[model samples]
Target: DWYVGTEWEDKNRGLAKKVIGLQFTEMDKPTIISTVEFSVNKKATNLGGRPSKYLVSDTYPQKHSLEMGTSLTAVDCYLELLLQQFVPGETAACSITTKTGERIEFELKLEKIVKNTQVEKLSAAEIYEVALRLKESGVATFKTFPKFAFDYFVRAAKLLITYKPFDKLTKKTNGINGQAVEELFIQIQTNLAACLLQEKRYEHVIY
Candidate 1:
């Protein structure tokens, strides 16, 4: 029962329900997941492990970074994962126990994550706003979960591409213009490159 107010989590949950047509419910209090014992290796004996084929990065052992207020890193990652894999009428929880015996957890309820909006239905301005919201989500979660953030940026890019709002020579819609769309596109691409760098996928970063 933490952060019971109009915060970032609340805002995203509300936005998804309204704009994306997803369902959400109040989550139960968090429960313990597992405890981690911290250890330090004095020597670098091992070289490396095999490469992962997954496009998104793994979600564990997160170091606390840039989340608002006094939120735990594990909780932040949990929320991100829920947003990514949200299914219709699905509910999920994730938790972690630190070496210090502290437990962090979060829960989510979702009708579905993969709701397809009719692009034609959205006005030009609405399309741009949606893309911007996706990009913002990616940026906010990048530090805690780069893999999930990468997908957000990619989706933002795709929406802009499909709409091609920048191609309109005259009479731009409210809250959208050729220049603003171009700038948003560039920012999304740049952020995607940063996400790739975090994954150490240098080759893909070049693209």
Candidate 2:
């Protein structure tokens, strides 16, 4: 209710309604709702980047802290983390170990090639290609941010599932093969399992 009485509140309501509709149609069992808070990092003075390019709403507060409540499965956690990369001027605290057995602090931020692309509009072949790129990005960041890598792999795997069996998409773009798509899907699945193992989530490793 932080955005109450504002246009952002209306937008939140509309988005919530869409999510509720999706929950009813796409899920059978009760979905688990999770709450998270994201505050704009003090170091994020450059809010004139992706947020400005994609968001036209001048009313939307750029520096406001946001608390979101949404349904999440284990896999959806990755989706949420991956999506968070798009939130301009946002930062997540992170630390990683160095070769000399030293630990250093870092901030998770947007990628250099981040885009405002919509996954729904992409063709199956395009999605496959995008998934490959996402996997690559995931791998590149695995050492510093394993969770982000896991998120990327999960996203790629789910997107690849949209064309399940990849039957009719063989001839779509650049003659992408169904077999190749399947291979990529399997690779992502394996990568996700590896991430689970890395996180000590042994139970999830089986599936």
Candidate 3:
């Protein structure tokens, strides 16, 4: 007759020192008990309804946005249902007794479809041109320069070119060669270098 102890003691020390000194049974003794059965709702499946809610604004500048806070309710409910079937400290067994008195054992496996961030569609030329401008403007030099100074220069440059398109050149794949793009890149780089040098000299004189 092994019984659980009901006294507070140091976790590091075992139950060797009982104040009342009660006799306890051996730890290896086995107790016979009836097996417990569990089951899940057979009809549990994804609703597959509208996964997200959206809001559209009709102001001077028409805008559309997803209502994220309210749209995650279905996801939360699905996760809660999954956690309910877990057995505490033991392996769970599910058996269904059929109409003909036949015992049918079933295994439950849950699956979920997770959505990830969607990347914007852009051609290779578009990406290359943007990266080239970033490098020429010294914005990409943050990889080598001090973080704060590089960030300051990037912010100042952004203010100066508030609405200018960095990639103004339209996509033209016909008769396009590596030499053409490389030459254009070098021209932009040279102009940017000259402008930065002049700005630096002006700053030195003013300071």
Highest TM-score scorer: 2
Q: Rank the candidates by lDDT, best first.
A: 1, 2, 3
Model 1 Cα lDDT, one tens digit per residue, 83-127: 433334333342334444443333344432233345567766776
Could you tell which candidate, 2 or 3, scores higher by TM-score? 2
What is the clash count for each candidate, in the order shown?
1, 0, 0
> Model 1, 176: alpha-carbon shift in Å?
2.3
The TM-score of predicted model 3 comes to 0.22
Using alpha carbons, what is the TM-score of model 2?
0.44
lDDT by residue for model 2 (3-100), tens = 12221112211111011001111111111121233322223222222121122233222322221112122222332333243333223443223234
Cα-based lDDT for every prediction = 0.48, 0.45, 0.30
TM-score, per-candidate, Cα-based? 0.43, 0.44, 0.22
Query: When superposed on Cα atoms, how far off is each prediction in RMSD?
Result: 14.5, 13.7, 25.5
Misplaced by over 4 Å in model 2 are 1-116, 172-175, 201-207
Model 3 stretches with alpha carbons more than 4 Å out: 1-122, 131-176
Q: State the number of backbone clashes in model 2.
A: 0
Task: Report residue 21 deviation for candidate 3 (angstroms).
Answer: 59
